[PDB]
């Protein structure tokens, strides 16, 4: 039988599992936790990601749309957060508009746990094994198949292993090692502060014009998004502050404990003190108690490939990214689509040698590697533009606009269907 082991039931692994289910490919999800938890973080999914969801199966996109929210329409206003003019009262000030970014096909955000809960409904219970904390991968002496070994002391067998086990992937460690110079995520030097406030309260402070649309407020060393989310009657305020310092290292298997700290209330206040009243007002709407999220990415120490032998990486295990152009989870869905399509070809074949399995995964990598690396770099650059790292873009709006629009187009208007046919063509070759 041809068996796919998916290590990790995050967004990437769950999306892949549904794609395989709907293509009649045998798989098992091995998840280290007792359940998929309840992490509430908000993830924004872009058009390219929504197309890949649909292509996996319409129920993946439906799972998403059932729990997602958005502003009215797909236009985002990019403003200069410093040089708002006219008043200290945002209700009568004039936002300093740089340009508008129109998102063809729109974007939506959801709580991660809500999307997880919808997707999991579509996966049979007998396809998910909890408390399976993958520790190592070896090769079976008799068969040459992968042997998974879990911390509970048990093993499993598979023809291919898909590491969907996130930013601190054990599958990645198995492939490429753990030493100080190994592929790994590192701090991107950006801290996330975010909150939701009742939409009517935001309108009372900022006025209706400034709560009518999504706005990204650029400025020196930090930026903030104010996004009115209609279906939840809330204004989402998402600030990112650049931090030249290192992130303190904590020994923990919990990614929350690794990448989150309590935030002293004055941190956001200080970062935005030189901004205009709209930004200072928005930031003041954060709860006095909040958390900060240290964003890590794989820009500096990327993996050299997504596949080795019968093992591969997808999602944040492969290409953890800053979220400056949308949640990096979107690319886990693109990865999942390619894997679903290639693995369906193997699942149909009378026999699949280790060579053919390995070549299949290599094809997956050939199709996704360059684009995936591009996102990690482009997203980091986007942060640099929005925080005026190199130049005051408040004073060069037209230039800024050309740069952001171009990179947005390459990401969001990607040929999803062509990616699949490319994969199947190359698979043929190999
Ligand atoms: C605190 C925090 C805040 C975040 N905030 C944001 C945000 O604001 N915006 C945004 O876009 N993204 C955010 N993210 C990231 C987002 O959750 C992920 O990008 C998204 O879930 C896609 O990642 P993934 O599915 O590839 O992997 P993950 O979501 O990391 O899923 C990995 C899964 O594999 C399991 N696993 C790990 N190791 C093993 C192992 N050895 N054996 C078995 N199972 C294993 C994990 O338990 C988990 O279920 C945040 C993440 C964290 C931790």
Numbering used by the authors: 8 to 437
Question: What is the paper's account of this structure, in its own sentences?
Answer:
Sorbicillinoids are yellow secondary metabolites synthesized through an elegant combination of enzymatic and spontaneous biochemical processes. The flavin-dependent monooxygenase SorC and oxidase SorD are crucial in this interplay, enabling the generation of a diverse array of functionally complex sorbicillinoids. SorA and SorB work in tandem to synthesize the hexaketide precursor sorbicillin, while SorC and SorD are involved in the subsequent oxidative processes, including dimerization and oxidation reactions.11,12 Specifically, the monooxygenase SorC catalyzes the oxidative dearomatization of sorbicillin to form (S)-sorbicillinol. The oxidase SorD can then use hydrated sorbicillinol and oxidize it to oxosorbicillinol.
SorC crystallized as a monomer, which is consistent with size-exclusion chromatography and mass photometry analyses. The general structure was solved at 1.4 Å, and consists of two domains: a Rossmann fold FAD-binding domain (residues 9–185 and 302–403) containing a binding site for the adenosine diphosphate moiety of FAD, and the catalytic middle domain (residues 186–301) that binds the substrate. In class A flavin-dependent monooxygenases, substrate binding generally initiates flavin reduction by promoting the out conformation of the flavin. The crystal structure of SorC without sorbicillin shows that the oxidized flavin is already in the out conformation. This allows a passage for sorbicillin to enter into the active site. In fact, two poly(ethylene glycol) molecules reside in or near the entry of the active site of SorC. The out positioning of the flavin also generates a cavity close to the cofactor that provides space for the nicotinamide to enter and allow reduction of FAD. Analysis of the environment around FAD revealed that the cofactor is in the out conformation. Trp300, located on the re-face of FAD, forms π–π stacking interactions with the isoalloxazine ring, thereby stabilizing this out conformation. Furthermore, a flexible Arg201 residue provides additional hydrogen-bonding interactions with the O4 and N5 of the isoalloxazine ring. In SorC, the residue Asn331 promotes the FAD out conformational change by forming H-bonding interactions with Gln197.
